[PDB]
Amino acid sequence: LRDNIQGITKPAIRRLARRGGVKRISGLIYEETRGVLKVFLENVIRDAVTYTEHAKRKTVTAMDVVYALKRQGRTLYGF
């Protein structure tokens, strides 16, 4: 399945901005944050799939994902 960048809906972006304390949200920022979320996701996902392919592993586990997040200096607690 392709064209899934539209899955991150505009109200979901608005909720993310409200959590960030944003009062006024432009209509042109939704494409930009979809782009940056996509870029961050390709970075983390490519690190995760390199971790997965290193260990003869075919399904991506939660451990590798958080290890990738930590090696990009964005360590995630709770997994």
Binding site: A12, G21, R24, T33, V49, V66
Partner: protein, 96 residues
């Protein structure tokens, strides 16, 4: 047709989504987007539920922090509405 001010409900939603820790992006579209992104790297790749969960938590946290930085850029520029130039400036400051 009682109508609230355009900017009071914004602050109310800010308070509601800052007090609560429930996730904002729905799990199914984020999972589908993750599979779409990963299908260009490994063919027929499987994602466990906790992996997608952790990826979602990290992605929402990164987006939230970037949104605070862009909002701070907006107030720094004597502005309220965020614009993609704020996102570009925030990304380039951290060298992303």
């Amino acid at each position: 047709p009682h109508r609230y001010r355009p900017g009071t409900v914004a602050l109310r939603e800010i308070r509601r989504y800052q007090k609560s820790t429930e996730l904002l992006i729905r799990k199914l579209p984020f999972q589908r987007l993750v599979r779409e992104i990963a299908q260009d790297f490994k063919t027929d790749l499987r994602f466990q539920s906790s992996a997608v969960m952790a990826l979602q938590e990290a992605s929402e946290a990164y987006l939230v922090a970037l949104f605070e930085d862009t909002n701070l850029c907006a107030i720094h520029a004597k502005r309220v509405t965020i614009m993609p130039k704020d996102i570009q400036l925030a990304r380039r400051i951290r060298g992303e």
